[PDB]
């Protein structure tokens, strides 16, 4: 009768190593109504979502999927793949150094120490993670794949789109850190747009879905917050320019024929942290239920 | 491949007065050792969540993520009041949540409904002490009750009949429509009733697509018409505004807040409202009058 450990059903985790021998925690979850890994119905082709910063978002994505089974608009199923780090007994949900490297953009013209490991991570997902996850579901077809990331994760998702647009069907960038390294992601966006009237018209174009907390660009003052702290947060907001930078990015890629659709929605009253659950839930359900997103 | 087991959390079963079984899932910050705070900050808020099986992991991970935010206060404790649903493949207990979360109407009894007072007794008498027993090196600064849909209806019942029981009442997309909007009667009763000074706060949320749904990709006419009629029937926004009208300027409430999430539906808003309400309760207390 005594208190017990909380163990999840319809989920599992395992460790994979990248080319460098760096260890990743892969956490996988799937619908509760499935019997083992096998779909309970003929509905056996389902969307799959990859989530970077896996340790911070796995449970949120998993429970969102499970709750969605009760909704009328339920697509019938989905698979969650959280790409995280070994943080057992650290008391942390982020690996600062690893994610710093893994999620930031390579700049070979001017290298940045401890950063620019996105291509190594993308290689790892394509070569190792994806096949390993498919091995787990022999009786499942995967209809489409989404990449979700928040902050540096969002920057990573934008990099993936602008350098490997055929790798995923959906790129979900929550509060993307477009500020990073002199806004060097805007260079990749410009190069992407710089690259079919006489073609047969057959293409497989990705969609970009972006989100932001309203309090990021426009913070609200806290209770009994000193003038020094308040002014500081207003300057940080200006420095990061989360909304300004996102609007500029959308300006660059608007009408780009290499893109199917670009969506953006802002959550009023949500901050950089609180928006994470909102954007992941909204993006994942859109990807599951309302695909494709209209032009 | 191994099982996913959570740290800094546990679950146990408690029975109400009727001998009905409940799954109590509890979680606390990762930086704590065992059940003990690692710092000065050992006076923390606590949140009770009904439909615990559907929302425990969402509240837990939200709490853990806030530890990384600059606006962090030392966190708090999650208490998800759920049902025994092992091997069912379900996150809701239809029948029992139906009973537990709906308002009693002795005037005109509704079979399979109106068990809210019994659940409130269960929380006050059994759940609350059992949880306090788990944390000997923690004092609870304040308590919030969160519920969504029938859960939100339950939260409003708790506010209007037992306003001193909790510090905050967080009603996400409350089913005000239920049983001819009988909760509005309790809201009226609350304002007209006889009578430091501790007043409760009401925090309400709604998905924008509940009152005003968004047409799906080439959705057939009859499907679209059905959802618009359903939206009319439930009148989630219309009913919520009317309720706010009834309690507007009532001095027996500390504050009433309402936030609408554009682009979120009845399902997707759950994580949004829980995360926002809980973080507000944790980090921005008290809400200004």
Tally of CB atoms within 10 A around B126: 16
Are B15 and B252 in contact by the 8 Å Cβ rule? The answer is: no
Which residues of chain B neighbour A267 with C-beta distances below 8 Å?
261, 272
A129: tokens are 């993670």
- C-alpha A242/C-alpha A179 separation (Å) is 7
Are B231 and B212 in contact by the 8 Å Cβ rule? The answer is: yes
Which residues of chain A neighbour B58 with C-beta distances below 8 Å?
59-60, 63-64, 277
A interface test, pick of B1, B70, B216, B260 with most A CB neighbours within 10 Å? B1
Question: Cα(first)–Cα(last) distance of chain A, in Å?
Answer: 56
B265–A73 CB contact, under 8 Å: yes
In Å, what is the CA distance from A180 to each residue of A77, A219, A252, A274, B152? 36, 20, 17, 21, 41
| Burial label, A89 (beta-carbon count in 10 A; 0-12, 13-18, 19+) | exposed
In Å, what is the CA distance from A290 to each residue of A79, A147, A150? 16, 16, 21
* Stretch (H or E) spanning A153: helix A152-163
Resolution in A: 2.0
| Burial label, A293 (beta-carbon count in 10 A; 0-12, 13-18, 19+) | middle
- C-alpha A70/C-alpha A65 separation (Å) is 10
Which residues of chain A neighbour B274 with C-beta distances below 8 Å?
277
The boundaries of the domain holding residue A290 are 1-295
Long-range pairs for B101-109: beta carbons < 8 A, 24 or more residues apart: B101/B50, B101/B51, B101/B147, B101/B150, B101/B151, B101/B153, B101/B154, B102/B150, B102/B153, B102/B154, B102/B178, B102/B179, B103/B153, B103/B157, B103/B178, B103/B179, B103/B182, B103/B183, B103/B186, B105/B179, B105/B182
- C-alpha B155/C-alpha B47 separation (Å) is 12
Residues 253-292 of A with CB under 8 A from B: 265, 267-274, 276-278, 280-282, 285, 289-292
Which residues of chain A neighbour B285 with C-beta distances below 8 Å?
223
The secondary structure of chain A in percent helix, strand, coil, rounded to multiples of 5, reads: 40, 20, 40
Q: What are phi and psi of B65, to 5 degrees?
A: -70, -35
SS3 A47: strand
Are A59 and A160 in contact by the 8 Å Cβ rule? The answer is: no
Which residues of chain A neighbour B27 with C-beta distances below 8 Å?
6
Residues 203-262 of B with CB under 8 A from A: 216-217, 259, 261-262
Residues 31-90 of B with CB under 8 A from A: 31, 54-58, 60-62, 64-69, 71, 86, 88-90
A18: tokens are 């990248």
Q: Which among A29, A89, A290 is the nearest to B216, CB-wise?
A: A290
Q: Which of B8, B20, B121, B99 is nearest to B57 (CA)?
A: B8
SS3 A279: helix
Which residues of chain A neighbour B11 with C-beta distances below 8 Å?
3-6
The domain total for chain A is: 1
Question: Does residue B286 have a cis bond before it (omega within 30 degrees)?
Answer: yes
Q: Which among A11, A32, A94 is the nearest to B89, CB-wise?
A: A32
- C-alpha A153/C-alpha A159 separation (Å) is 10
Structural method: X-ray
Task: Return the sign of the alpha-carbon dihedral for residues B209, B212, B213, B214.
Answer: negative
Helices (H), chain B: 52-66, 94-100, 116-122, 128-134, 150-161, 178-181, 183-192, 208-211, 221-234, 236-247, 269-283
B64–A70 CB contact, under 8 Å: no
Residues 87-116 of A with CB under 8 A from B: 88-89, 91-94
Question: Does residue A292 have a cis bond before it (omega within 30 degrees)?
Answer: yes
Q: Which of B57, B46, B76, B71 is nearest to B146 (CA)?
A: B46
Q: Which of A277, A49, A246 is nearest to A158 (CA)?
A: A246
A interface test, pick of B52, B268, B286 with most A CB neighbours within 10 Å? B268
């Amino acid at each position: 009768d005594k208190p017990a450990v909380v163990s999840l059903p319809s989920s599992e985790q395992f460790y994979l190593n990248n080319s460098r021998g760096e260890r990743y925690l892969i956490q996988v979850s799937w619908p509760l109504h499935w019997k083992d890994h096998k779909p309970d119905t003929d509905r056996n082709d389902v969307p799959l979502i990859y989530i970077v910063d896996g340790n911070a978002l796995f449970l949120t994505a998993t429970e969102a999927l499970w709750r969605r089974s009760a909704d009328s608009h339920y697509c019938g199923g989905g698979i969650v793949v959280a790409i995280g780090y070994p943080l057992e007994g650290t008391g942390k949900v982020y690996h600062r150094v690893r994610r710093g490297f893994d999620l930031t953009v390579p700049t070979p013209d001017s290298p940045v120490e401890g950063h620019g490991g996105a291509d190594i991570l993308l290689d790892f997902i394509a070569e190792t993670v994806r096949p390993a996850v498919r091995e787990r579901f022999p009786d499942v077809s995967v209809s489409r794949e989404a990449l979700y990331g928040h902050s540096y994760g969002g920057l990573f998702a934008l990099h993936a789109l602008f350098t490997r647009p055929s790798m995923f069907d959906a790129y979900i960038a929550s509060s993307p850190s477009i500020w990073w390294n002199g806004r060097c992601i805007l260079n990749e966006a410009k190069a992407f747009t710089r690259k079919g009237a006489y073609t047969n018209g057959e293409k497989k174009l990705p969609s970009l879905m972006m989100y932001l907390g309203g309090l990021e660009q426009d913070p609200r003052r806290w209770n009994d917050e000193p003038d020094e702290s308040w002014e500081g947060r207003k300057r940080d907001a200006e420095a990061f320019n989360m909304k300004v930078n996102l609007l500029e990015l959308m300006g660059l890629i608007r009408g780009c024929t290499r893109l199917h659709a670009v969506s953006f929605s802002e959550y009023a009253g949500e901050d950089h942290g609180t928006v994470m659950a909102c954007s992941l839930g909204r993006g994942f359900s859109t990807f599951m239920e309302d695909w494709p997103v209209p032009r």
